[PDB]
Amino acid sequence: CRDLKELRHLAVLNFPKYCEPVVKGRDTRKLWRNIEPHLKKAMQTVYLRELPYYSKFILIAAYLASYNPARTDKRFFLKHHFPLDRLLAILYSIVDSRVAPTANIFSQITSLVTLQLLTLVGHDDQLDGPKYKCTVSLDFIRAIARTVNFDIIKYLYDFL
Amino acid sequence: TSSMSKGCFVFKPPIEDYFNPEDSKLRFETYQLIWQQMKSENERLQEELNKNLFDNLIEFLQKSHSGFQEIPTAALVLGVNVTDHDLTFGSLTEALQNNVTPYVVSLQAKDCPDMKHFLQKLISQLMDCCHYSMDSLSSWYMTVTQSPPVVVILKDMESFATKVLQDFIIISSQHLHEFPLILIFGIATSPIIIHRLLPHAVSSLLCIELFQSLSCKEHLTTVLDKLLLTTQFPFKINEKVLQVLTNIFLYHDFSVQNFIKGLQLSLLEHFYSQPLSVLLPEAKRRINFLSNNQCENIRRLPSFRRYVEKQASEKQVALLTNERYLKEETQLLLENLHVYHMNYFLVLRCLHKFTSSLPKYPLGRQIRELYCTCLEKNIWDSEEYASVLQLLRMLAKDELMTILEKCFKVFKSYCENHLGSTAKRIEEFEVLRENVVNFIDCLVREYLLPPETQPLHEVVYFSAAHALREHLNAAPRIALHTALNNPYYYLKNEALKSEEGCIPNIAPDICIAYKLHLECSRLINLVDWSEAFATVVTAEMNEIIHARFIRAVSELELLGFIKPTKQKTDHVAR
Amino acid sequence: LIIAMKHLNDIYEEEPFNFQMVYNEFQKFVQRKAHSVYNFEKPVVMKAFEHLQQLELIKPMERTSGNSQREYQLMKLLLDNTQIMNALQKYPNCPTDVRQWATS
Amino acid sequence: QTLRNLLSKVSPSFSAELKQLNQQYEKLFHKWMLQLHLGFNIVLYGLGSKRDLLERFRTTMLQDSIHVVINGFFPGISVKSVLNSITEEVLDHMGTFRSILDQLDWIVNKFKEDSSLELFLLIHNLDSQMLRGEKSQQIIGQLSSLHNIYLIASIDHLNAPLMWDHAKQSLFNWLWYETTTYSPYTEETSYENS
């Protein structure tokens, strides 16, 4: 941080904790030892200052569809050896229970589109062959997978 | 007149009568009164559960405006519950304009695609809260002031374009001295999203602070406790509807308004279906005005007939022949059902108070789970009951007396009619712990019984859950496939009963055409398909068969199963 | 970051790049060294890249937004290797480690 | 494709079961009117042309009140046309509007000011190509959010549920009824040029 404004702002924010130890009772070593961990905590943010059940499965399926080539789909899901239909097939494969195609899942899809988690690619008038892309970070999908007890790394073709 | 080329057609020419009648009128009046009370209580609960955040917002705004006498900004996380935002915002604006500032402007992202339109709408709403540019806004503020700040609400910032946001932030930063400005952010996703929308050159000008709102699950628990587990409302629900509503809520939306809609529809259907649902003191007085046909209807009840079979033959004849004695006995049974409802609710609440401190929560955490698992079957007939009892028998004395103190608070609050000796014993207190556990077990066996085991329960219960499913959670694909595959279920024509998956030639043209399409490849050749259809229907004429084929193809294309392809002539994919 | 960009241009002759590759190879550089004081997280590096793009030293190709994020976006450098070497020669307090990485 | 005019001579089959099926559907008019009058909108879905059933419902129950019928299967219908028709007849206003949103604001304000106006909407083939715009459905939902407007809609396309979002679902306040009529789609495919 060479910005004068930002460094001055940081000094203004952190000065009261600088002056607490002397109020509590020119001891350079004492001040530095008392203040060092707070400085490390502050540096963690220099410039910085619970989904429904089926939504998590939709999100992880969308991530898999986005980051897995289509050629390997059967290799990961077929028991013996991107468009919406691929997503539906992958979702049906993943979930152990038979899920009915209730309109509420389509409402969930549209809401996820609204929340800027899934981006619509094709034309708005074309709602029979729509295209989607996933914009969720890998750490986020790993974290949400852990809360579901699912290992997404075992199915990612790129890592394998 | 409804088939012309022009698509625009227009034509020019009591509430209760559509429901048909006197009993129907009374039922409609009771429906209106009960819905009024229910939604009023819902609003009362909605207002109550936000004080601890509203006061914090007020104090934050006061602290921020104290300096003016760097743009202060408060971040408010509201979750995915898109329906709750409007009600919460109504309450929020009713708080601020009543306390701190009569200038509140809430804005959408849909109606502000450009900064020009944004400023136009902003100044237009500021005009009636009491070319267009920032100088005009400053002059208007000076005129109205000649010092309250101004509050602007951004509801859905996910749909907002960034550029207008940075422009508004940078322009407003240079005129803070001219007029104060404070921003309130409502974010559905995690607060991290704000870092991905504003460049740091713009973000550095804001002093952001974070609040968080109430969780939806606690809201649902409070609503369920206040509106269904209480004794102030005569209507009750069977277990199937509770399970389906809970499934919908917990799996789809986490919204309470949908649950309220389901409850209202259940009440409406219950009053439409049962004529005897006309029926505390109101039912007491309404019994005297009962009609003979309704007396026969009461005589026809399944629970009533089982109860009559339980009684003696002489009492059987007396009930089946006499009316006033029947009215009095039904009155007594209604009072007994009332008492059963009272003690069931009290015992369940006390049991959950005991259960709330149990580790690993063998029988759940909240009211709803214990209530539904008690409604399903008897808890005491399951080995899980024994496991809970043996886990209860290992509690420490200090935790046991804390649980007893909470239960004693419950007793002193609303256990008012029966068993004060229970609280007396609690005050008195391994042997003592075992005695307490045995007494609790005796209470559970005595008082926790399914409502289906008592007669005349059908008056205050509803059981047509499948219609509720088919009217709220539709399955257009399943219904369409059922219509296409096995039209026997809709027609009951034995000519359609051959097998499953085979080809009934007697079936209509659309059904056989769809079934021929199913077995073919992913690309459908129209000439080969037409030949197959002609072969099926065979078991002047050619033109008629071709006409039926064309009509079926057009219908299927309209329904969406057909998309034309130009890769191969006369081919279609699914 | 600029030295990493030059290395990308050298290894991949006259081809675009994105943020992920630059981050990966900066991680490679800081991981080869035993215990150098460069323990920085993703957001600060992302902000640094945004600041660099703001100064118009890097320009996008076939501009589009929404469909593609700031990440995974084709970026190109608008500088010459000799210019970087000359500027780094006159840098006041360039550390030895980064200089030797640049020479490599 | 000119032969389509002469192809209309084919006789139907098993018409008796269709007659009983239509008779069964006829009994739900009173309940549907009760649900509409209390603030609910109903979509009818099922196999077969249900336009005849809607016409029967109109001529049986909607001959004493103001009602608007929109046969959206016509490829020339647009939301602005519906708005112009409503403004010119329902409110008897001739003045032009600078924008669609301004027209909607005027209509909403007028209907909020006048609580004595009740209007019924009958839309055929809501899944039409011209009505699949997101703004179209948003406008229709905002109109239907008022308690003085009643809406009956029909679905014939498979991917219809993708049209509605959670907020749009809350605004529309839908109830569903399964009504399979097995009627041929003669008129709805007649205007369509294959």
mmCIF file with all atom_site columns, N, CA, C and O in Angstrom, chain B residues 95-112:
data_model
loop_
_atom_site.group_PDB
_atom_site.id
_atom_site.type_symbol
_atom_site.label_atom_id
_atom_site.label_alt_id
_atom_site.label_comp_id
_atom_site.label_asym_id
_atom_site.label_entity_id
_atom_site.label_seq_id
_atom_site.pdbx_PDB_ins_code
_atom_site.Cartn_x
_atom_site.Cartn_y
_atom_site.Cartn_z
_atom_site.occupancy
_atom_site.B_iso_or_equiv
_atom_site.pdbx_formal_charge
_atom_site.auth_seq_id
_atom_site.auth_comp_id
_atom_site.auth_asym_id
_atom_site.auth_atom_id
_atom_site.pdbx_PDB_model_num
ATOM 1  N N  . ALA B 1 95  ? -41.095 2.577  10.065  1.00 0.00 ? 95  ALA B N  1
ATOM 2  C CA . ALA B 1 95  ? -40.323 2.927  11.253  1.00 0.00 ? 95  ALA B CA 1
ATOM 3  C C  . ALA B 1 95  ? -39.598 4.259  11.086  1.00 0.00 ? 95  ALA B C  1
ATOM 4  O O  . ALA B 1 95  ? -39.664 5.124  11.967  1.00 0.00 ? 95  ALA B O  1
ATOM 5  N N  . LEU B 1 96  ? -38.893 4.436  9.965   1.00 0.00 ? 96  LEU B N  1
ATOM 6  C CA . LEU B 1 96  ? -38.037 5.608  9.800   1.00 0.00 ? 96  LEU B CA 1
ATOM 7  C C  . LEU B 1 96  ? -38.853 6.890  9.668   1.00 0.00 ? 96  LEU B C  1
ATOM 8  O O  . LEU B 1 96  ? -38.561 7.892  10.331  1.00 0.00 ? 96  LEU B O  1
ATOM 9  N N  . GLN B 1 97  ? -39.875 6.885  8.806   1.00 0.00 ? 97  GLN B N  1
ATOM 10 C CA . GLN B 1 97  ? -40.653 8.103  8.594   1.00 0.00 ? 97  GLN B CA 1
ATOM 11 C C  . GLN B 1 97  ? -41.411 8.523  9.845   1.00 0.00 ? 97  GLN B C  1
ATOM 12 O O  . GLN B 1 97  ? -41.795 9.692  9.962   1.00 0.00 ? 97  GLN B O  1
ATOM 13 N N  . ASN B 1 98  ? -41.636 7.599  10.777  1.00 0.00 ? 98  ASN B N  1
ATOM 14 C CA . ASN B 1 98  ? -42.303 7.916  12.030  1.00 0.00 ? 98  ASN B CA 1
ATOM 15 C C  . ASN B 1 98  ? -41.346 8.442  13.092  1.00 0.00 ? 98  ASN B C  1
ATOM 16 O O  . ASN B 1 98  ? -41.791 9.112  14.031  1.00 0.00 ? 98  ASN B O  1
ATOM 17 N N  . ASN B 1 99  ? -40.046 8.169  12.964  1.00 0.00 ? 99  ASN B N  1
ATOM 18 C CA . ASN B 1 99  ? -39.097 8.455  14.036  1.00 0.00 ? 99  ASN B CA 1
ATOM 19 C C  . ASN B 1 99  ? -38.084 9.523  13.642  1.00 0.00 ? 99  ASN B C  1
ATOM 20 O O  . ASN B 1 99  ? -37.980 10.542 14.333  1.00 0.00 ? 99  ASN B O  1
ATOM 21 N N  . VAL B 1 100 ? -37.337 9.334  12.556  1.00 0.00 ? 100 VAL B N  1
ATOM 22 C CA . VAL B 1 100 ? -36.145 10.125 12.287  1.00 0.00 ? 100 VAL B CA 1
ATOM 23 C C  . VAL B 1 100 ? -36.313 11.033 11.073  1.00 0.00 ? 100 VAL B C  1
ATOM 24 O O  . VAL B 1 100 ? -35.972 12.216 11.136  1.00 0.00 ? 100 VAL B O  1
ATOM 25 N N  . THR B 1 101 ? -36.837 10.513 9.961   1.00 0.00 ? 101 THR B N  1
ATOM 26 C CA . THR B 1 101 ? -36.826 11.297 8.735   1.00 0.00 ? 101 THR B CA 1
ATOM 27 C C  . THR B 1 101 ? -38.017 10.970 7.845   1.00 0.00 ? 101 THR B C  1
ATOM 28 O O  . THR B 1 101 ? -38.221 9.791  7.514   1.00 0.00 ? 101 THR B O  1
ATOM 29 N N  . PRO B 1 102 ? -38.796 11.970 7.431   1.00 0.00 ? 102 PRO B N  1
ATOM 30 C CA . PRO B 1 102 ? -39.928 11.724 6.531   1.00 0.00 ? 102 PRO B CA 1
ATOM 31 C C  . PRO B 1 102 ? -39.562 11.635 5.058   1.00 0.00 ? 102 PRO B C  1
ATOM 32 O O  . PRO B 1 102 ? -40.460 11.705 4.214   1.00 0.00 ? 102 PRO B O  1
ATOM 33 N N  . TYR B 1 103 ? -38.282 11.486 4.722   1.00 0.00 ? 103 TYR B N  1
ATOM 34 C CA . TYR B 1 103 ? -37.823 11.376 3.338   1.00 0.00 ? 103 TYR B CA 1
ATOM 35 C C  . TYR B 1 103 ? -37.211 9.992  3.148   1.00 0.00 ? 103 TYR B C  1
ATOM 36 O O  . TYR B 1 103 ? -36.040 9.773  3.477   1.00 0.00 ? 103 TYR B O  1
ATOM 37 N N  . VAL B 1 104 ? -38.000 9.061  2.617   1.00 0.00 ? 104 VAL B N  1
ATOM 38 C CA . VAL B 1 104 ? -37.544 7.711  2.310   1.00 0.00 ? 104 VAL B CA 1
ATOM 39 C C  . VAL B 1 104 ? -37.936 7.396  0.874   1.00 0.00 ? 104 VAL B C  1
ATOM 40 O O  . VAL B 1 104 ? -39.099 7.569  0.492   1.00 0.00 ? 104 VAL B O  1
ATOM 41 N N  . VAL B 1 105 ? -36.971 6.936  0.082   1.00 0.00 ? 105 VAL B N  1
ATOM 42 C CA . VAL B 1 105 ? -37.175 6.635  -1.331  1.00 0.00 ? 105 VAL B CA 1
ATOM 43 C C  . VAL B 1 105 ? -36.635 5.237  -1.598  1.00 0.00 ? 105 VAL B C  1
ATOM 44 O O  . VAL B 1 105 ? -35.421 5.012  -1.531  1.00 0.00 ? 105 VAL B O  1
ATOM 45 N N  . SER B 1 106 ? -37.530 4.301  -1.897  1.00 0.00 ? 106 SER B N  1
ATOM 46 C CA . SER B 1 106 ? -37.156 2.947  -2.276  1.00 0.00 ? 106 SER B CA 1
ATOM 47 C C  . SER B 1 106 ? -37.218 2.810  -3.791  1.00 0.00 ? 106 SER B C  1
ATOM 48 O O  . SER B 1 106 ? -38.141 3.319  -4.433  1.00 0.00 ? 106 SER B O  1
ATOM 49 N N  . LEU B 1 107 ? -36.232 2.121  -4.360  1.00 0.00 ? 107 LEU B N  1
ATOM 50 C CA . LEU B 1 107 ? -36.068 2.061  -5.803  1.00 0.00 ? 107 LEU B CA 1
ATOM 51 C C  . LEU B 1 107 ? -35.840 0.625  -6.255  1.00 0.00 ? 107 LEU B C  1
ATOM 52 O O  . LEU B 1 107 ? -35.293 -0.203 -5.522  1.00 0.00 ? 107 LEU B O  1
ATOM 53 N N  . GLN B 1 108 ? -36.269 0.345  -7.481  1.00 0.00 ? 108 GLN B N  1
ATOM 54 C CA . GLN B 1 108 ? -36.069 -0.945 -8.123  1.00 0.00 ? 108 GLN B CA 1
ATOM 55 C C  . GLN B 1 108 ? -34.887 -0.880 -9.085  1.00 0.00 ? 108 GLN B C  1
ATOM 56 O O  . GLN B 1 108 ? -34.395 0.192  -9.441  1.00 0.00 ? 108 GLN B O  1
ATOM 57 N N  . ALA B 1 109 ? -34.429 -2.059 -9.502  1.00 0.00 ? 109 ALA B N  1
ATOM 58 C CA . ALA B 1 109 ? -33.439 -2.153 -10.566 1.00 0.00 ? 109 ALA B CA 1
ATOM 59 C C  . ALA B 1 109 ? -34.080 -2.284 -11.938 1.00 0.00 ? 109 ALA B C  1
ATOM 60 O O  . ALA B 1 109 ? -33.460 -1.922 -12.944 1.00 0.00 ? 109 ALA B O  1
ATOM 61 N N  . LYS B 1 110 ? -35.307 -2.807 -11.993 1.00 0.00 ? 110 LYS B N  1
ATOM 62 C CA . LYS B 1 110 ? -36.003 -2.958 -13.265 1.00 0.00 ? 110 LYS B CA 1
ATOM 63 C C  . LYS B 1 110 ? -36.312 -1.607 -13.898 1.00 0.00 ? 110 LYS B C  1
ATOM 64 O O  . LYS B 1 110 ? -36.179 -1.438 -15.116 1.00 0.00 ? 110 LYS B O  1
ATOM 65 N N  . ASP B 1 111 ? -36.725 -0.634 -13.090 1.00 0.00 ? 111 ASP B N  1
ATOM 66 C CA . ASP B 1 111 ? -37.178 0.656  -13.594 1.00 0.00 ? 111 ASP B CA 1
ATOM 67 C C  . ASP B 1 111 ? -36.053 1.671  -13.750 1.00 0.00 ? 111 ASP B C  1
ATOM 68 O O  . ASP B 1 111 ? -36.325 2.819  -14.116 1.00 0.00 ? 111 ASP B O  1
ATOM 69 N N  . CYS B 1 112 ? -34.807 1.287  -13.484 1.00 0.00 ? 112 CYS B N  1
ATOM 70 C CA . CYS B 1 112 ? -33.662 2.192  -13.580 1.00 0.00 ? 112 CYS B CA 1
ATOM 71 C C  . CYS B 1 112 ? -32.569 1.551  -14.426 1.00 0.00 ? 112 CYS B C  1
ATOM 72 O O  . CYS B 1 112 ? -31.525 1.137  -13.908 1.00 0.00 ? 112 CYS B O  1
#
